Design a protein around this ligand. Structure first.
Ligand SMILES: *[C@@H]1O[C@H](CO)[C@@H](O[C@@H]2OC[C@@H](O)[C@H](O)[C@H]2O)[C@H](O[C@@H]2O[C@@H](C)[C@@H](O[C@@H]3OC[C@@H](O[C@H]4O[C@@H](C)[C@H](O)[C@@H](O)[C@H]4O[C@@H]4O[C@@H](C)[C@H](O)[C@@H](OC)[C@H]4OC)[C@H](O)[C@H]3O)[C@@H](O[C@H]3O[C@H](C)[C@@H](O)[C@H](O[C@H]4O[C@H](CO)[C@@H](O)[C@H](O)[C@@H]4O)[C@@H]3O)[C@@H]2O[C@H]2O[C@H](CO)[C@H](O)[C@H](O)[C@H]2O)[C@H]1O
Ligand SMILES: *[C@@H]1O[C@H](CO)[C@@H](O[C@@H]2OC[C@@H](O)[C@H](O)[C@H]2O)[C@H](O[C@@H]2O[C@@H](C)[C@@H](O[C@@H]3OC[C@@H](O[C@H]4O[C@@H](C)[C@H](O)[C@@H](O)[C@H]4O[C@@H]4O[C@@H](C)[C@H](O)[C@@H](OC)[C@H]4OC)[C@H](O)[C@H]3O)[C@@H](O[C@H]3O[C@H](C)[C@@H](O)[C@H](O[C@H]4O[C@H](CO)[C@@H](O)[C@H](O)[C@@H]4O)[C@@H]3O)[C@@H]2O[C@H]2O[C@H](CO)[C@H](O)[C@H](O)[C@H]2O)[C@H]1O
Ligand SMILES: *[C@@H]1O[C@H](CO)[C@@H](O[C@@H]2OC[C@@H](O)[C@H](O)[C@H]2O)[C@H](O[C@@H]2O[C@@H](C)[C@@H](O[C@@H]3OC[C@@H](O[C@H]4O[C@@H](C)[C@H](O)[C@@H](O)[C@H]4O[C@@H]4O[C@@H](C)[C@H](O)[C@@H](OC)[C@H]4OC)[C@H](O)[C@H]3O)[C@@H](O[C@H]3O[C@H](C)[C@@H](O)[C@H](O[C@H]4O[C@H](CO)[C@@H](O)[C@H](O)[C@@H]4O)[C@@H]3O)[C@@H]2O[C@H]2O[C@H](CO)[C@H](O)[C@H](O)[C@H]2O)[C@H]1O
Ligand SMILES: *[C@@H]1O[C@H](CO)[C@@H](O[C@@H]2OC[C@@H](O)[C@H](O)[C@H]2O)[C@H](O[C@@H]2O[C@@H](C)[C@@H](O[C@@H]3OC[C@@H](O[C@H]4O[C@@H](C)[C@H](O)[C@@H](O)[C@H]4O[C@@H]4O[C@@H](C)[C@H](O)[C@@H](OC)[C@H]4OC)[C@H](O)[C@H]3O)[C@@H](O[C@H]3O[C@H](C)[C@@H](O)[C@H](O[C@H]4O[C@H](CO)[C@@H](O)[C@H](O)[C@@H]4O)[C@@H]3O)[C@@H]2O[C@H]2O[C@H](CO)[C@H](O)[C@H](O)[C@H]2O)[C@H]1O
Ligand SMILES: *[C@@H]1O[C@H](CO)[C@@H](O[C@@H]2OC[C@@H](O)[C@H](O)[C@H]2O)[C@H](O[C@@H]2O[C@@H](C)[C@@H](O[C@@H]3OC[C@@H](O)[C@H](O)[C@H]3O)[C@@H](O[C@H]3O[C@H](C)[C@@H](O)[C@H](O[C@H]4O[C@H](CO)[C@@H](O)[C@H](O)[C@@H]4O)[C@@H]3O)[C@@H]2O[C@H]2O[C@H](CO)[C@H](O)[C@H](O)[C@H]2O)[C@H]1O
Ligand SMILES: *[C@@H]1O[C@H](CO)[C@@H](O[C@@H]2OC[C@@H](O)[C@H](O)[C@H]2O)[C@H](O[C@@H]2O[C@@H](C)[C@@H](O[C@@H]3OC[C@@H](O)[C@H](O)[C@H]3O)[C@@H](O[C@H]3O[C@H](C)[C@@H](O)[C@H](O[C@H]4O[C@H](CO)[C@@H](O)[C@H](O)[C@@H]4O)[C@@H]3O)[C@@H]2O[C@H]2O[C@H](CO)[C@H](O)[C@H](O)[C@H]2O)[C@H]1O
Ligand SMILES: *[C@@H]1O[C@H](CO)[C@@H](O[C@@H]2OC[C@@H](O)[C@H](O)[C@H]2O)[C@H](O[C@@H]2O[C@@H](C)[C@@H](O[C@@H]3OC[C@@H](O)[C@H](O)[C@H]3O)[C@@H](O[C@H]3O[C@H](C)[C@@H](O)[C@H](O[C@H]4O[C@H](CO)[C@@H](O)[C@H](O)[C@@H]4O)[C@@H]3O)[C@@H]2O[C@H]2O[C@H](CO)[C@H](O)[C@H](O)[C@H]2O)[C@H]1O
Ligand SMILES: *[C@@H]1O[C@H](CO)[C@@H](O)[C@H](O[C@@H]2O[C@@H](C)[C@@H](O)[C@@H](O)[C@@H]2O)[C@H]1O
Ligand SMILES: *[C@@H]1O[C@H](CO)[C@@H](O)[C@H](O[C@@H]2O[C@@H](C)[C@@H](O)[C@@H](O)[C@@H]2O)[C@H]1O
Ligand SMILES: [Hg+2]
Ligand SMILES: [Hg+2]
Ligand SMILES: [Hg+2]
Ligand SMILES: [Hg+2]
Ligand SMILES: [Hg+2]
Ligand SMILES: [Hg+2]
Lengths: 436, 436, 436
């Protein structure tokens, strides 16, 4: 009886499962690895740290490899609860990775927002906001230390750790541009906050110290790294109409085998506003009260999952004038494409089309070579922004192809593409195999 | 100092960890794969799309393999906030997969509910409800597009992608039965909603386009696929008593090496009602107010994690009249079995017993061959449904082996079993190795 | 067009991705494994089950291997909503694993709390609280069955399943110490709850039944298992000042290759209180009301993510009087270290420093050999606990290096280290390779 009686229940169908076993689940043999040690070491920042200033850092050569890099910010609130939306993230307006004077990759604050909306999830995503925002209803004057993790290729997996020991004659530098205006810190809307403190900045790089055997191999041998890059093109959204469905074709200027496309429609006035402001809880300042105004967002709750507030009705991609796939609704690129390939949840206003089975995985799993495509076009059709944004009854009770009239503020269209490339390192110098 | 001083701290105990390294964490070699492309292509639906109608689709032969399949529904609300509970999921009452006239698998809406409660989790599970329900407090008349992803074997992993190119002489068809009554869409309780719109349906299949090398291999070579199937038997729950603990033995008519058993006790009147209605927040219409009534649920919040509202007190399985394991409480099959083998959270009223170490994984990891068992029995003991469901003090303050008196409405008992089988494909035809 | 036109877009850059394929994503070959069966079997408990009592269990030899072990508790509430905080977890004050009279590992209730805060996440972590607490606003007299899963080496992965069949001459025993006072069960603060029921205890061990081939191998062959252990040292926190920043150096008495360090500052009066009590929602009894008192916590909401309520300002580790790394703020060890190596979220007051790339993984990925270090020191600097804890305006609006004046109650400092060891099993006896 019990367990033993099930073992005896053996038949011909078990041959496909347990006939002549190859593995066992009850005796794992663990792999032995190369000895190493990790140390997070502070870097020197060249230039004056302040709003709207450009600063740079040349990575010191303390260890053999480098992996994670974190930027530390200390900021002080200028408003009360819900008046900030990822201020530390917005503050890092853009960050450039350079090896031997050659640009390897460059990221932007809006990419950090889009990456977080697509590829982070669950408690990890909430911990990320803890690192970049006030999430405890803090008031005016609250001061907090923030941690912005970089997400370049060697930051995302130790298997791509950048070998400083093999880059003897090439310096590795990071160029930072700090934002000038950050909501809830030094600016409230367009009015500056008097007495707002300048930010203080610190840069920390995690180093790997290798044993003698592997150290000598890294220094003497040539290396090839399959790395990822970011491509970004900022376009102007066609003005959506309250009487007709506007359309638009954007020529895609991308290169290299590309894993996926990701785009959003954002209002440049408000960081992360990817959807239309409306008079429903969390969609505008003072929503559901006598002070409701759809001109100003509920900053702490700028994001939403309500597809009704998204502006894109349908979209498709064309290759040399032919449909790459049949037109799908905007919700397909927001819900189904992340469901099929990511497995998290993406707020409305952020869209994905994946060429890869696993776009979040480092291992390649399907790409499109945009370097071999003469014409690539993103065809867009917008909803009819005819809903009264001040009426919750109208916003919460409407049809698929209409949206709030405040969608006309979503004037900026940001399209991102994540591609692969090869970083060859030999004779103390690094270089990308393909420029375009 | 720092990192380097830890490397020198080397001893005899490090031999088991780093002595003669086999792997390194800092130089990942990625695998090269076969070139391919994905395209989601719309299918033709034969038959009239409407409530209570049967429609079918014969998969067109555009590509070499097929993977994901999504059913698109457009629906209009008939009620306000919290008056729908997975309407798009319920609408797809059952879906049958057929290859060459032979049934390969068949799923049901209640299986989608049970699968979601057991194997989906976190943001992925919330994104799934976004695809199948209104989650933004929408009002009467709100119209939304829904996406119901199929979960047959080739839908769940690209490694089991169905090769249409190798099924030249066998058609692959899907048979859909649409529900007749869906709460919050065309029916409110048992009263039809006047002017309710018929649903519109669309079926999309993702195709894989293979390169010439692999294309020829798939078309000429014989193939064997280790696939999964669903077995379902619907039984009548024994009437639980308010004065004694009712018991019941259900003979299990299952076959094949089975990964796990999953069952629920549901009230057929309400979709997904797996627990007793009670006068506590979220457990009945107007709970905690003067309009509270335990005859009608809070539809938007039909599920619960409160074990007190579950009807099963204890259960065990018997093999040929002998205990397969000692009796455990119903909470064990709801909490511990998912904890030990799934790692998510399952609402009360859904129970699991796993024969596998990893029942959610496609790779087999332990099964029981129900084809070699003459008698398999699920022995059940029910709680004494003697709690006053209208009293929150009684519901929120009671003992282990009692439940709310409204548990007598949980009359339907659905038992599911997930088994393995072999799909052999050769000479343009597919066929299952084992029928029973 | 469509998918097929992308396949033709092939170039020289695709050689690194798809040139001469090694793998395919569309034909997974699953591994065949050794046949087995699982059975959860109840154990005998020696000694009287009660608050403050020590009981033990000698594992019966029903099967070949053992894996998961769960302790079942039945408890009755003595208070209303939010008056319990993981009572089943606290009740299991400490549990010792012993093989042949030799201690293999020993865990504590505070380790369960710290482990849950660091390595559990998402729905799994919420399901764990369902197994160890009331989470449905239950009132006085509610009785619930709880499940405390053990987390020794063979409990966490079946690949380390303890082979009873190979331990013929060594008994495997578990020694439990039950807590004497549990908030919300038999004690309210320091006042006992009259008529509180003694707990009832049950111990269940999951057995693996092996087939003849593998059974004989396990019984005759020598075995080596790479297992993990817990090291714990309890220290007294230096009294933090409201006028200066107190500091403290703790000599670390640890051994073996250690994966990570984890520590907290807790108030022994309240289970899991890792942060200072304050007059903000969820931080003290009756917070935000006329009955607010920072002397008593909101038990149901004892944890927090608000770094302001944490007492540690900065910390670093020293090796033989030299900095192992540069000083970082306490939030770094609470936010960044879990972000970089765990990927969840950790409440404030729990700190991590990892020597491993993946400290939650069983496969070793970097350790420090504390057996080869003569002096290891944790250097601590505390915040100035000068904030008026009774003032929400002061707590929610302050600077980085200050905390609430109630932080002086965080007098206990618990430091944990997770190390590796080798369990050798031969001739029917088990033994650890290294004692220190
Ligand atoms: C994003 O989503 C989150 C999750 O829903 C929101 O948080 C929730 O808000 C609703 C709460 O019920 C829930 O508990 C909370 O989780 C978030 O809302 C915004 O941020 C929260 C923290 C609130 O801000 C706090 O609001 C209270 C203010 O305190 C003042 O309140 C006055 C009524 C008192 O007279 C005055 O003395 C202040 O309070 C005292 O100090 C506070 C800190 C103590 O807690 C309190 O003790 C109890 C007093 O000390 C003794 C805080 O300064 C502020 O940080 C939201 O504010 C809304 O909800 C409050 C419950 C309500 O009181 C607020 O009304 C006040 O402010 C509005 C203007 O905002 C005035 O018109 C009104 O007269 C009153 O003064 C307000 O309804 C925040 O939301 C608001 O501001 C946002 C800014 O982006 C946005 O504009 C939003 O639409 C607004 O609703 C969401 O951002
Ligand atoms: C499942 O769990 C969710 C999470 O807890 C619940 O959502 C929460 O509900 C409590 C809120 O505090 C919280 O913000 C919310 O997240 C969910 O509850 C159900 O769905 C929500 C969205 C509510 O429904 C909305 O309720 C308000 C209705 O609006 C009318 O309200 C009247 C008071 C006004 O006079 C009238 O003008 C309407 O409002 C106007 O229109 C709305 C859309 C605008 O927002 C409002 O502007 C502020 C007005 O415009 C100017 C909406 O139609 C409806 O969709 C829950 O309703 C409960 O909570 C409300 C806060 C409260 O107002 C409700 O009372 C009204 O309805 C009840 C009957 O339902 C009447 O008896 C009462 O007189 C009043 O008219 C109500 O207490 C929903 O819950 C209810 O219905 C459920 C149906 O399955 C179920 O029966 C449940 O027990 C009910 O409580 C949960 O389902
Ligand atoms: C941790 O975080 C959780 C998430 O925020 C909290 O839960 C939330 O609490 C706020 C709610 O709005 C929200 O819905 C809920 O999710 C949690 O709070 C604690 O636990 C919850 C469940 C509440 O406890 C319940 O509170 C109501 C009590 O019922 C009595 O209420 C009286 C007003 C009635 O007169 C009396 O008849 C009782 O109610 C009747 O019985 C209940 C069960 C029925 O539901 C009710 O029907 C509607 C009546 O039956 C007809 C329950 O016994 C108790 O379990 C929190 O309590 C706060 O919030 C309540 C909404 C409010 O009513 C409470 O006030 C009562 O108690 C306080 C003292 O606690 C008295 O001073 C006051 O006069 C009144 O009697 C109270 O404000 C719980 O929080 C409190 O207790 C904690 C103990 O650790 C802690 O001390 C905390 O600070 C307190 O606020 C959080 O723990
Ligand atoms: C947690 O956070 C909450 C906010 O999120 C805090 O509440 C805020 O407090 C400020 C308010 O403006 C705001 O509305 C409120 O949200 C909370 O603080 C404590 O709780 C509140 C409710 C206050 O308690 C009340 O204090 C007044 C007492 O009444 C006496 O007042 C005298 C002036 C009269 O002379 C005397 O007769 C009393 O009044 C009478 O009796 C009361 C019950 C009747 O309602 C009233 O009717 C008109 C009178 O009837 C004859 C109340 O009993 C008590 O409940 C906070 O108290 C502070 O703020 C008050 C506005 C202020 O008046 C208080 O000063 C009085 O008490 C102090 C000692 O506390 C005396 O030294 C002084 O002479 C005066 O008597 C006081 O500044 C509470 O905060 C105090 O106590 C806390 C611990 O309980 C804590 O120690 C804090 O630092 C103290 O400030 C937070 O706990
Ligand atoms: C989508 O957005 C548009 C633009 O914002 C919005 O239309 C605006 O609605 C407000 C109105 O003042 C503006 O003129 C209009 O542009 C639309 O709302 C819905 O469609 C419009 C055309 C109205 O429908 C018409 O109602 C009157 C009725 O005689 C006529 O047959 C019908 O077509 C909206 O109805 C609302 O506004 C009317 C002015 C008002 O009279 C209505 O009250 C009647 O009906 C309600 C129930 O709907 C009864 O409770 C009441 O006693 C009375 O009979 C009503 O307030 C309509 O919105 C309303 O219906 C939709 C679904 O069709 C949703 O449920 C809304 O929540 C609900 O307000 C948006 O859908
Ligand atoms: C489980 O479900 C059952 C069935 O619904 C429920 O019993 C129902 O309770 C309501 C009552 O009207 C029905 O007859 C009964 O079927 C049960 O509740 C609990 O058990 C019953 C037997 C009552 O206990 C008895 O209370 C009276 C007392 O003299 C006697 O010694 C005791 O056994 C429930 O107590 C409630 O209902 C009584 C009618 C009422 O008099 C009680 O008030 C007294 O006690 C309360 C505190 O419990 C005092 O605040 C008050 O001043 C007075 O002294 C009380 O309302 C009992 O429920 C109560 O206790 C349980 C735990 O035992 C829970 O905390 C409840 O939340 C609480 O209401 C359910 O447990
Ligand atoms: C951190 O904790 C400390 C200790 O708890 C706390 O200081 C306590 O604050 C309360 C006060 O009674 C105690 O003496 C003090 O120990 C600190 O709060 C902040 O710093 C102190 C020094 C005060 O600043 C001073 O305010 C008066 C002003 O003339 C002077 O220039 C300024 O330095 C706190 O201000 C509060 O308490 C004062 C007694 C009161 O007069 C203030 O009201 C004035 O300012 C407020 C806005 O700040 C106006 O709305 C009001 O009309 C009036 O002009 C005020 O209540 C100061 O806290 C206040 O400011 C900080 C940021 O500096 C936060 O926003 C607080 O939320 C806010 O209350 C804690 O930061
Ligand atoms: C969106 O459509 C709404 C309904 O017509 C308008 O109310 C709104 O106009 C804005 O707000 C109103 C109140 C007026 O002040 C307008 O001048 C303003 O542009 C539209 O944005
Ligand atoms: C923390 O600092 C607060 C502000 O000074 C004090 O109120 C608090 O003192 C406690 O509470 C007050 C109300 C008094 O009762 C004190 O005796 C008590 O110690 C400090 O803990
Ligand atoms: Hg393309
Ligand atoms: Hg418009
Ligand atoms: Hg079986
Ligand atoms: Hg009953
Ligand atoms: Hg060390
Ligand atoms: Hg202090």
């Amino acid at each position: 009886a019990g367990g033993l009686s099930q073992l005896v229940a053996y038949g011909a169908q078990d041959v496909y499962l347990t006939g002549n076993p190859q593995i066992t689940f009850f005796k794992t043999v663990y792999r032995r690895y190369t000895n190493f040690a990790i140390e997070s070491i502070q870097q020197t920042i060249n230039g004056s740290v302040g709003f709207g200033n450009k600063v740079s850092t040349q990575i010191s050569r303390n260890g053999d490899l480098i992996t994670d890099i974190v930027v530390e910010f200390v900021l002080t609130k200028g408003g009360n609860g819900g008046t900030t939306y990822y201020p530390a993230e917005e503050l890092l307006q853009d960050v450039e990775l350079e090896i031997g004077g050659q640009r390897i990759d460059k990221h932007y604050n809006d990419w950090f927002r889009t990456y977080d909306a697509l590829f982070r999830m669950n408690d990890d995503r909430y911990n990320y906001r803890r690192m970049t925002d006030w999430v405890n209803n803090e008031l005016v004057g609250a001061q907090k230390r923030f941690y912005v993790p970089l997400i370049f290729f060697f930051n995302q997996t130790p298997g791509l750790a950048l070998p400083l020991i093999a880059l003897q004659y090439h310096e590795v530098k990071l160029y930072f541009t700090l934002a000038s205006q950050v909501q809830g810190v030094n600016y409230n809307g367009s009015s500056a906050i008097a007495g707002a403190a300048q930010p203080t900045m610190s840069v920390w790089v995690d180093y790997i110290f290798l044993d003698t055997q592997e150290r000598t191999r890294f220094a003497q041998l040539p290396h090839e790294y399959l790395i990822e890059q970011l491509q970004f093109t900022g376009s102007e959204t066609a003005t959506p109409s309250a009487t007709t469905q506007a359309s638009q074709n954007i020529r895609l200027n991308f290169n290299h085998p590309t894993k996926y496309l990701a785009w959003n429609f954002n209002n440049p006035t408000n960081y992360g506003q990817y959807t239309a402001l409306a008079n429903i809880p969390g969609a505008c300042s003072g929503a559901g009260t006598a002070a409701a105004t759809v001109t100003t967002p509920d900053y702490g709750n700028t994001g939403t999952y309500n597809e009704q507030l998204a502006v894109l009705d349908s979209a498709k991609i064309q290759l040399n004038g032919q449909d790459r796939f049949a037109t799908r609704k905007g919700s397909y690129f927001n819900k189904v494409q992340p469901y099929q390939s990511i497995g998290g949840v993406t707020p409305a206003g952020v869209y994905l089309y994946s060429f890869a089975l696993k776009p979040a995985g480092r291992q390649p799993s399907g790409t499109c070579n945009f370097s071999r495509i003469d014409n690539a076009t993103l065809s867009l059709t917008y909803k009819t922004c005819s809903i009264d944004a001040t009426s919750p009854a109208a916003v919460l009770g409407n049809t698929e192809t209409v949206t709030a009239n405040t969608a006309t503020l979503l004037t900026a269209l940001n399209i991102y593409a994540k591609n692969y490339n090869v970083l060859r390192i030999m004779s103390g110098m690094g270089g990308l195999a393909y420029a375009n």
